[PDB]
Nucleic acid binder design. Structure first.
Length: 187
DNA sequence: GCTATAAACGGGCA
DNA sequence: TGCCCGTTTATAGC
């Protein structure tokens, strides 16, 4: 384990990637839904052709403007790969699709400090960052400021980390919270 | 299933 | 304007 960005020795698994990209062409979603078998289009419910591929297991959202969203991938490149696959499926249907302005929009990762946490004690000494109402949701909602990352901390020691645009913020935010979570170990 | 979280999207509606 | 819906994913306690 690389103990330079991970002094803890713990590495958050990335669990979901959300990305955008501009096909930079106007599209007929009604037509796309007809010749593609992989596509569902409910213009009332959501003005988007919803498309999926098996590897990388992803779901895409394709809007007439030409903007496209890709979700479900386990990493940044994996997400890019899927978006490339979707853009080419579109090209194959006779549309001047390109691959303009690809952007990693959100990283979601999870990890495990491997010990229980007193969520109340954590929520009590960090009132400015925390939000813990275990009747609505069993997880503490910790909005870190540097970096601006949102952590979801639980009793078991399992942790969700979201709102990251670079995977180093996913890693930094956890590293920031680890010596805090040890402070409130549940014995 | 709903409860919560981040984020892109575009149509709809107060 | 703004807010919802829309998709995905870890988490887990009703």
């Amino acid at each position: 384990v690389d103990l330079s960005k991970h002094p803890s020795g713990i590495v958050p698994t990335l669990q979901n990637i959300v990305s955008t990209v501009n096909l930079d062409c106007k599209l007929d979603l009604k037509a796309i839904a007809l010749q593609a078998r992989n596509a569902e289009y409910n213009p009332k419910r959501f003005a988007a052709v919803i498309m999926r591929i098996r590897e990388p297991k992803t779901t895409a959202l394709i809007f007439a403007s030409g903007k496209m969203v890709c979700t479900g991938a386990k990493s940044e490149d994996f997400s890019k790969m899927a978006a490339r696959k979707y853009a080419r499926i579109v090209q194959k249907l006779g549309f001047p699709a390109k691959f303009k302005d690809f952007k990693i929009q959100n990283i979601v990762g999870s990890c495990d400090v491997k010990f229980p946490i007193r969520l109340e004690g954590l929520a009590y000494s960090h009132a400015a960052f925390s939000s813990y109402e275990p009747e609505l949701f069993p997880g503490l909602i910790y909005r870190m400021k540097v970096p601006k990352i949102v952590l979801l901390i639980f009793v078991s020691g399992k942790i969700v980390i979201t709102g990251a645009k670079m995977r180093d913020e996913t890693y930094k935010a956890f590293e920031n919270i680890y010596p805090v979570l040890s402070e409130f170990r549940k014995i």
